[PDB]
Each structure stands twice: as C-alpha cells, then as structure tokens.
Amino acid sequence: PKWSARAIKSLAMGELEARKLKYPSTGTEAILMGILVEGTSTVAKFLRGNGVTLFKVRDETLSLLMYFFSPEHPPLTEPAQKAIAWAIDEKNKSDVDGELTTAYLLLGVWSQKDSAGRQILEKLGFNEDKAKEVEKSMNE
Ligand SMILES: [Cl-]
C-alpha cells in the first residue's frame, strides 16, 4: 500500500475535478481525468499520445452525464472504489517490489467493465492491446 507521488496527485486532482464540475459523486471518469490533469507520469504521456486527452475526456464525459444538487464532497462511487481496490490487489501479488504507480490506477479503471472510465477510454481508441502495452510499461 505504498502510493507513488504521481498516483496521489492524480486522485487529488480527480476529486477536485469532480467538485469543479459539480458532479454528485467522484467516479472512474474523475480518476482518469486526475491522471491527465497530473500529466507527467509514463501512462499519462502514453494516453496523450494515443488520442486520450483531458479535453476529449472532459468532452466524452458530458456525452454521458443538469446537476444542481451535488454535495460539497462528492463521494467515490462503488466502481471508483473497485478500481482502487484492484490497483492494490494487483500490486500486492506482482511478485516484485515497487510502489503502485498511475499505471495501476489506469488498469484499475480499465478492469471495471461497467465503469464510465472503461467506456470513455474505449470511445477514444483504448483497447486490450494498449492495456497490455501499459502493463508492460509498468514492469519496464
Ligand atoms: Cl507514476
């Protein structure tokens, strides 16, 4: 359970993005946006290179989701929770030492097949080959 600095900034950026945008909860789409707002990790550059950018993610999000009753603190959705749990679980069995980077967080969103993050990623051109490609990057 040792989070990289860029993973921590990402989540923080995701939750703040959820408040900025007046969302009733903080979901997988915020995690994904959090990574891109952070923007300096290996996986963020990878996404940005394969046509997945904040602008397009922000856009693809409206195409999914008025909202005038959102709480001051948008709680994590169950899929967001499941994506973070997935990142923990994958790292605790990786049979290697290391911190859990933003790539684990991205594969966590990707592992949640009903999630808004899963959808948006596909809608932008992300696929299983690219996920094995990121999973290869996370191991070098
Ligand atoms: Cl990282």
The CATH class? Mainly Alpha
Number of helices: 8
Task: Based on the coordinates given, report the CATH architecture.
Answer: Orthogonal Bundle
What value does the Rg take, in angstroms?
14 Å
CATH superfamily: Clp, N-terminal domain
* Overall tally of structural domains: 1
The CATH topology annotation reads as Double Clp-N motif
Structural class: mainly alpha
The N- to C-terminal Cα distance equals 20 Å
Domain Clp R: 1-140
Region (Repeat 1): 3-65
Protein name: ATP-dependent Clp protease ATP-binding subunit CLPT1, chloroplastic
Region (Repeat 2): 76-140
Write the layout of secondary structure elements.
Blueprint: H1 5-20, H2 28-38, H3 42-49, H4 54-62, H5 78-91, H6 102-110, H7 116-124, H8 128-137
Helix pairs in contact: 1-2, 2-4, 2-6, 2-7, 4-7, 5-6, 6-8
The structure holds chloride ion (CL).
PDB class: protein binding
Keywords: caseinolytic protease, N-domain, alpha helical bundle, plastid, protein binding
Assembly: monomeric
